[PDB]
Design an enzyme around this catalytic site. Structure first.
Site, PDB file in Angstrom:
ATOM      1  N   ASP A 151      -0.700  -7.230   2.015  1.00  0.00           N
ATOM      2  CA  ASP A 151       0.109  -5.905   1.976  1.00  0.00           C
ATOM      3  C   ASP A 151       1.342  -6.137   2.120  1.00  0.00           C
ATOM      4  OD1 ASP A 151       0.146  -3.256   1.699  1.00  0.00           O
ATOM      5  OD2 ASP A 151       0.169  -2.557   3.689  1.00  0.00           O
TER       6      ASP A 151
ATOM      7  N   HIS B 171       0.817  -1.144  -0.301  1.00  0.00           N
ATOM      8  CA  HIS B 171      -0.221  -0.118   0.004  1.00  0.00           C
ATOM      9  C   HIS B 171       0.970   1.167   0.052  1.00  0.00           C
ATOM     10  CE1 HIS B 171      -0.232   0.954   4.607  1.00  0.00           C
ATOM     11  NE2 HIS B 171      -0.015   2.001   3.985  1.00  0.00           N
TER      12      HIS B 171
ATOM     13  N   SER C 156       4.266   3.120   8.250  1.00  0.00           N
ATOM     14  CA  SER C 156       3.746   1.925   7.210  1.00  0.00           C
ATOM     15  C   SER C 156       4.786   1.486   6.233  1.00  0.00           C
ATOM     16  CB  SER C 156       2.440   2.463   6.674  1.00  0.00           C
ATOM     17  OG  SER C 156       1.392   2.652   7.453  1.00  0.00           O
TER      18      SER C 156
END
Lengths: 43, 258
Positions: B99, B43, B205
């Protein structure tokens, strides 16, 4: 440490992976690692 | 990273900054597995509704950095991306399942006191180390708090940030959110009712949730920060992508394209 991927395609690095030049490589520990160790009560 | 602390120089050499070229903004964490393959949130690369269809030409990666922006000379090396491989069952339309992202550098990064790969789990390690309540270390240049308290400039740590976190009982987490916590994710966070607060924030992230084995002394990237609960998301626990569960796919790619 019995490796996986092909040194040839994976790239140099697997054999001595996960051991820290400034830390594990001298027995010397890091401000908070004993914290991690002591979390391992199960088994 | 929330209620994280500064990292001792070197404390996680695997840590990679994923940089946007034009403009230049931090984009995400990213682990390094070998002098050529690197690991990140899918992502972090291809999420359309936040305008992300990044390609090999748009990005750099920054290896063995401490100071989030002081271009640390004679320490950090700047690799260029030769290609980005995105788990192809990852579909940004449904959810955060799979992901995961592999990035191949053009040029084998030299190892130094500050650049040096992370090991990866074997089923053996998973089962002994990935336990409800075992703590695991997450490192990042994500923002330090809820995003309109104080001032962007404070809230944006100046060096790399460190935080360890307990693994969460799969029901405990599952119950905690209407997002499906799949087969292929795990949850990290302190007890709901707890006295620290630690977590990961958007910027974080992509980087590595990591645990050190006590049997062989090595550092294993059990996860990827997939969607922390820190900062603005302020949901209950952070989801991580299960690295092992996807090792089969990891090898499929390297072997094919290394």
């Amino acid at each position: 440490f019995h490796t996986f991927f092909n040194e040839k395609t994976f790239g140099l690095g697997e054999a001595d992976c996960g051991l820290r030049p400034l830390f594990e490589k001298k027995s010397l520990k890091d401000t908070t690692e004993k914290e991690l160790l002591d979390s391992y009560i199960d088994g | 990273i929330v209620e994280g602390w500064d990292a001792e120089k070197g404390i996680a050499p695997w840590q990679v900054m994923l940089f946007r070229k034009s403009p230049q903004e931090l984009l995400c964490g990213a682990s390094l597995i070998s002098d050529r393959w690197v690991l990140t949130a899918a992502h972090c690369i291809l999420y359309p509704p936040w305008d992300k269809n990044f390609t090999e030409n748009d990005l750099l990666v920054r290896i063995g950095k401490h100071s989030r922006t002081r271009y640390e000379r004679n320490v950090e090396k700047i690799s260029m991306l030769e290609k980005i491989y995105v788990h192809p069952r990852y579909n940004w339309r449904e959810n955060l399942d799979r992901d995961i992202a592999l990035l191949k550098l053009k040029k084998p990064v030299p190892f130094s006191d500050y650049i040096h790969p992370v090991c990866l789990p074997d089923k053996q390690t998973v089962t002994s180390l990935l336990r409800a309540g075992y703590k695991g270390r997450v490192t990042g240049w994500g923002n330090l708090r809820e995003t309109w308290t104080t001032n962007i400039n404070e809230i944006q740590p100046s060096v790399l940030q460190v935080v360890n976190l307990p693994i969460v009982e799969r029901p405990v987490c599952k119950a905690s959110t209407r997002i499906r916590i799949t087969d292929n994710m795990f949850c990290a966070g302190f007890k709901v009712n707890d006295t620290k607060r630690g977590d990961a924030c958007e910027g974080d992230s992509g980087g590595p949730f990591v645990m050190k084995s006590p049997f062989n002394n090595r550092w294993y990237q059990m996860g990827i920060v997939s969607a922390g609960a820190g900062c603005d998301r302020k949901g209950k626990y952070g989801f991580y992508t299960h690295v092992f569960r996807l090792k089969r796919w990891i090898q499929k790619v390297i072997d094919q394209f290394g």
